[PDB]
Amino acid sequence: MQIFVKTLTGKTITLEVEPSDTIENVKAKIQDKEGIPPDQQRLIFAGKQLEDGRTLSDYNIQKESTLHLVLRLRGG
Template sequence: MQVNLTTLSGQSYRFDAEPSDLVETLKSKIFHELSVNPKQQRLVFNGKKLEDCYTLKDYNIQDGGKIYLVLRLRGGM
């Protein structure tokens, strides 16, 4: 299946995935494609933050599902 990833700036990407893939696996794919550290990634689907230890199927993400990528920025001055 393919999932659609959209950033808050509106950029869209497609990733091949399996329903049995862990969220952590998808974050790894995002890292290899976009060079965004998985620790900085927050993925959101249907208003829910996706936890690394669950599968895409656990969140009922299906082919064509739209996931949002929100970056965690480190604070500080």
């Protein structure tokens, strides 16, 4: 299953996830893809900021869904 990770500036990154994959496992994939560590990576889909020990399926993220990738500095 593929999901889109939309960055800030306008880069769309297409990842291949299982929906039985964790939010942690999406960050791992981006560390692989882009080189970003998961420390900085915050994810947003709708309103809340997604925690690591839950799956895409929990959150109810479908096929070809757009997640927003926020790069953590401190917090904002």
